[PDB]
Design a protein around this ligand. Structure first.
Ligand SMILES: O=C(O)[C@@H]1Cc2c([nH]c3ccccc23)CN1
Ligand SMILES: O=C(O)[C@@H]1Cc2c([nH]c3ccccc23)CN1
Ligand SMILES: *[C@@H]1O[C@H](CO)[C@@H](O)[C@H](O)[C@H]1NC(C)=O
Ligand SMILES: *[C@@H]1O[C@H](CO)[C@@H](O)[C@H](O)[C@H]1NC(C)=O
Ligand SMILES: *[C@@H]1O[C@H](CO)[C@@H](O)[C@H](O)[C@H]1NC(C)=O
Ligand SMILES: *[C@@H]1O[C@H](CO)[C@@H](O)[C@H](O)[C@H]1NC(C)=O
Ligand SMILES: *[C@@H]1O[C@H](CO)[C@@H](O)[C@H](O)[C@H]1NC(C)=O
Ligand SMILES: *[C@@H]1O[C@H](CO)[C@@H](O)[C@H](O)[C@H]1NC(C)=O
Ligand SMILES: *[C@@H]1O[C@H](CO)[C@@H](O)[C@H](O)[C@H]1NC(C)=O
Ligand SMILES: [Cl-]
Ligand SMILES: [Cl-]
Ligand SMILES: [Gd+3]
Ligand SMILES: [Gd+3]
Ligand SMILES: [Mg+2]
Ligand SMILES: [Mg+2]
Ligand SMILES: [Mg+2]
Lengths: 470, 472
């Protein structure tokens, strides 16, 4: 398949898709000569941390004597660049065998639009796909997406929570902005419905994107400038929001209350100190934090030399230390990860990373359910089992549909009729560190998704900066 | 795939068409290996669309002038209006390219299907030309690099709808949309235009061909519990039909249905036994087109004689309600005896789009044949060898194509690969002779006129629940 990858031989292979870059280089093809392949641009350090979590879990599992003793799990992991096209190349390789008529399960993708395209494909071959971050309600539809599950809750809930926060503060006047894609559009539509039920009025509603032109941006900023609304609900990823924010910062638009969907509420592309006068004090959703003992130590052993199997480790290094590998200065090889602050390690809570880790453990546990299957008390015809020596993707899907297990956090992980896994939300507020001068995601409440209306939202008003500054 | 239509040729065109309306929705407990889904309910109008493609190709081969050195071939599959079937087909289209042979594709129908396909063809810069997918999502050329269409996108249609409501001073309307890339974006556009005109929306529900009974009951309840008489519906017939059945069942009467073009002419909904519910709907229709020879071509269909079109056998069986060597078929019987949409039509609209999609591929190939070195489109004005053409060269030529159809019109695609078109506005009457439903034209929408001056309606021509000339 693709040139850049992370890959290790095993008896059973797990596919993986991660956004190691935020995007593709937009040298928009006029098709004057044969199109070469696009280049991926702007390193995503957080995304590399996500990919590490999958490798950590797979290595943790091959070490565990308990879980899958006779066998080893391998992996084939690719960069999507938040791009359907790159993600589809990689996926064509995952199903290369199957298509001619080997990959047992795929962990990914991140953006709901990317996961959709991938799912349309894997679904043809009943290859289970477990996403760590794709939250569009569209993916719950099991007629269209036969093999899709996720370790993240869908956005029906998040959008309802957004409307509940607004009602909580007795606000009744807002604007909305959403990314023009299968994450933003269905999310804000839901929010609209919920806002109406609670007599919350929406004065404007606009769509944006990573690739909006200057005229389209100017227009959105004008609508904003021209509106009495102080509270602006935004349903979007970092990359789709960054152009709008750059212009809003350029024109110095100040003291809006920004309500962030989980995709941008922790994004290092928006939570930048030079934007704080605009973006300070945003309130947003985050997934519940999880714990991976050993992970931080694993992330510090990265090395362009030592790491044979992870072929993303080279460019990681170069990006981190701003050098090149055997004028861009050459790299010693002996530089220290702890000297440069990047999102790779400069984090406090593991949230999406935890989902990656659970996505892998799900696949693993469903394989463990096949290892220990007792003939007669199995899930296939006449109580029969599946042969783990010769396992087929659809059998893992089957096992994933019936899975129930207890995670290191001591929780039961099972998937519903739609392949979703319910979860609660943290509510964070953007403060400025007086120690660092950097932005700090202060936890200020939580939303318990399944609870009687009026007993779901828990907030500490005392803790909130409304402009973000002490 | 087993069931197809194909013929060898120098350059192959792909084709996707909905020969069946859907799939048998048998949910799989995956206790054993899954078998494929079975396509259910034959779509005669869809067979005609596929016929228009084959017609246009043979005609083009017959033309000496257009592409002399070469013959055009075709490999043409059934999507069953399903992403999955369309993608199996598509994987075979790209099979050569992927391994690193198909030069262009015509289709698909449903925006949701063309979306899925377009993601795939786009990797390999294989041009795709849709005769019927009208989602604005498809105008986005960053995501859909190789997509064009011979149908206008719905931006105007949804605005037209809101112009119609403003005109009659209607005030608190209902909305219903198919849950897919046709319905959601159309209604999202409609809502924006309704906001600009201070038109309020009382409800908005989603529907689908595959919605269970609980999901339908709920929509029917929302409708029943509403004061809204005016209901805007953006959907295909097949996704709508389950809803209409239950509405007719509960006798829900005197609604004014505003019909998007995908169902405004649909034989699944335009059925006399629904006329007490569905009568008097107002809707949109594409400009008609003329195809000389085509009617005659449609009558030469034969399970025997048609060696290349492997859909004809099932066509025959479904038409005449027989079996092939549940009575056995003579193999002699007359197509012009049984009334089905295959031949029972007055105007060619989508069929004309199919035709034009094929000729657009053709005319872009022709412009390669006749390229003059130095005056061409590529590097240093260079040209492309037509003996060894590559899909992306056709894409390039298709982006800049400009030619004259048989109706005497200029066919070009804009920066987004779209094509503008006006609309007729039609109203659902009953036939006094026939008892069948009739699409009477009662207005037009002219897309070239300035904002506020695009709609025209003849009030006198409207029958208000199919029958009444007395309004309020
Ligand atoms: O489905 C989607 O597109 C968004 C993508 C996304 C989510 N969380 C994130 C955190 C960082 C970056 C991207 C994301 C949840 N779902
Ligand atoms: O993009 C879509 O899904 C539709 C499907 C469709 C259109 N026109 C039709 C006529 C007959 C049957 C189906 C259709 C236009 N847009
Ligand atoms: C914003 O305000 C000014 C004056 O009110 C107007 O000229 C401008 O066009 C407005 N823009 C938008 C997008 O509403
Ligand atoms: C932005 O606005 C603030 C307060 O409204 C003002 O004090 C400051 O000077 C402005 N910044 C710029 C760069 O104009
Ligand atoms: C998962 O296991 C626990 C007990 O171990 C049980 O309470 C729970 O109901 C199970 N979930 C499902 C969906 O079967
Ligand atoms: C509609 O009306 C009935 C009876 O008034 C009520 O019980 C039901 O909940 C309503 N359903 C909806 C969807 O409004
Ligand atoms: C449905 O109601 C209408 C009166 O509006 C009438 O034409 C028809 O007979 C009714 N049928 C039933 C079964 O109620
Ligand atoms: C197509 O050609 C005609 C004249 O031959 C011209 O009027 C028109 O501008 C052309 N269309 C486009 C889109 O270039
Ligand atoms: C649209 O309508 C106007 C008047 O009916 C006509 O002049 C124009 O050429 C039409 N364009 C079409 C059908 O493409
Ligand atoms: Cl991704
Ligand atoms: Cl189709
Ligand atoms: Gd609610
Ligand atoms: Gd407008
Ligand atoms: Mg092991
Ligand atoms: Mg809007
Ligand atoms: Mg010829």
């Amino acid at each position: 398949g693709p040139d850049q990858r992370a890959q290790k031989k095993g008896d059973i292979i797990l596919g993986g898709l991660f956004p190691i870059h935020f995007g593709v280089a937009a040298k928009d093809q006029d098709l004057k000569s044969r199109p070469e392949s696009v280049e991926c641009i702007r390193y995503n350090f957080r995304g590399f941390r996500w990919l590490q979590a999958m490798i950590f879990a797979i290595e943790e599992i091959n070490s565990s004597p308990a879980l899958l003793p006779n066998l080893t799990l391998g992996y084939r992991i690719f960069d999507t660049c938040n791009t359907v096209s790159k993600a589809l190349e990689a996926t064509l390789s995952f199903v290369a065998q199957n298509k001619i008529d080997s990959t047992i399960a795929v962990v990914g993708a991140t953006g709901s639009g990317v996961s959709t395209a991938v799912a349309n494909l894997l679904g043809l071959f009943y290859i289970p796909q477990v996403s760590y971050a794709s939250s569009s309600r569209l993916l719950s539809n099991k007629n269209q997406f036969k093999s899709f599950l996720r370790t993240i809750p869908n956005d029906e809930h998040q959008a309802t929570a957004m409307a509940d926060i607004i009602e909580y503060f007795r606000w009744n006047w807002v604007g909305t902005i959403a990314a023009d894609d299968d994450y933003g559009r269905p999310g804000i539509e839901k929010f609209r419905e919920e806002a109406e039920e609670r007599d919350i009025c929406i004065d404007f509603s606009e769509l944006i994107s990573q690739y909006s032109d200057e005229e389209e941006i100017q227009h959105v900023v004008e609508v904003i400038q021209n509106s009495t609304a102080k509270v602006i609900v935004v349903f979007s990823s970092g990359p789709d929001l960054e152009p709008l924010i750059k212009e809003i910062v350029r024109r110095n638009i100040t003291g809006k209350i920004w309500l962030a969907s989980e995709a941008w509420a922790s994004s290092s592309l928006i939570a930048m100190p030079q934007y704080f006068h605009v973006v300070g004090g945003t309130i947003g959703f985050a997934l519940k934090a999880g714990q991976i003992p050993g992970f931080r130590e694993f992330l510090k052993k990265v090395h362009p030399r030592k790491s044979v199997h992870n072929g993303f480790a080279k460019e990681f290094w170069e990006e981190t230390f701003n050098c090149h590998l055997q004028f861009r200065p050459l790299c010693t090889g002996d530089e220290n990860i702890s000297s440069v602050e990047t999102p790779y390690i400069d984090y406090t809570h593991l949230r999406i990373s935890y989902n990656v880790y659970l996505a892998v453990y799900s696949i693993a546990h469903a394989l463990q359910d096949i290892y220990t299957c007792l003939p007669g008390r199995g899930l296939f015809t006449n109580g029969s089992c599946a042969d783990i020596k010769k396992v087929e993707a659809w059998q893992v899907l089957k096992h994933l549909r019936h899975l129930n297990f207890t995670n290191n956090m001591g929780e039961q992980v099972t998937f519903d009729e739609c392949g979703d896994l319910v979860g609660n939300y943290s509510i964070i507020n953007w403060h400025l560190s007086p120690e660092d001068g950097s932005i700090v995601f202060k936890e200020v409440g939580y939303y318990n998704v399944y609870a009687k209306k009026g007993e779901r939202l828990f907030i500490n008003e005392e803790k909130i900066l409304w402009s973000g500054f002490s």
